[PDB]
Amino acid sequence: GRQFGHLTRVRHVITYSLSPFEQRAFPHYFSKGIPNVLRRTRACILRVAPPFVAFYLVYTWGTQEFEKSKRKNPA
Amino acid sequence: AGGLEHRQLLDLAQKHFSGLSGTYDEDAVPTLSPCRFTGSQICHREDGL
């Protein structure tokens, strides 16, 4: 159905690309990758974490409460 | 090239071109060097054409 050639109209855009045998596959895999990963993690942690922290708290409280309930009481 | 004789052209050149300098003043000798070739792509998108 959809094929290359008339998917959309584009004008005045130039693209430069380099052959895969003229360049490295791992340019800066440790010097620059790790700061980017830290940036992404810092961005996402505040959105993703608090629900799972709350689940952890509920899990601990429920397990402790069940264990306390099972044990017998004096009198 | 055409209708002419070689010695006449040589004499005229001796008359009118002997003033050119050809000593390569100092190390001003522009010499080419090998040029690197790169496999690559360039694309200018102009859908109006």
Residue ranges of domains in chain A: 1-75
CB proximity list for B45: less than 8 A, separation 6 or greater: A10, A11, A12, A13, A14, A15
Residues 6 or more apart whose CB falls under 8 angstroms from that of A26 comprise: none
Residues of A in contact with B41 (CB under 8 A): 15-17
Per the entry, the structure determination technique was cryo-EM
User: Which residues of B are less than 8 Å from A22 in CB distance?
Assistant: 38-40
Closest CA to A11 of B22, B48, B27, B24: B48
Q: In the numeric block, which tokens belong to residue B23? A: 């000593």
* Residues of B (10-49) whose Cβ lies below 8 Å from A: 38-48
Q: Which of A13, A26, A20, A25 is nearest to B40 (CA)?
A: A20
Contacts of B21 (CB under 8 A, 6+ apart): none
Q: How far is CA B32 from CA A25, A50, A58, B29, in A?
A: 33, 66, 76, 10
Tokens 């961005």 correspond to what residue? A43
Q: Tokens 């409460």 correspond to what residue?
A: A65
Contacts of B42 in chain A (CB under 8 A): 14-17
Mutation target for B interface from A7, A12, A21: give the one with most B CBs within 10 A.
A12
> How close is the nearest chain A Cα to the Cα of B37, in Å?
10
Please give the distance of CA A28 from its chain centroid, rounded to a whole number: 21
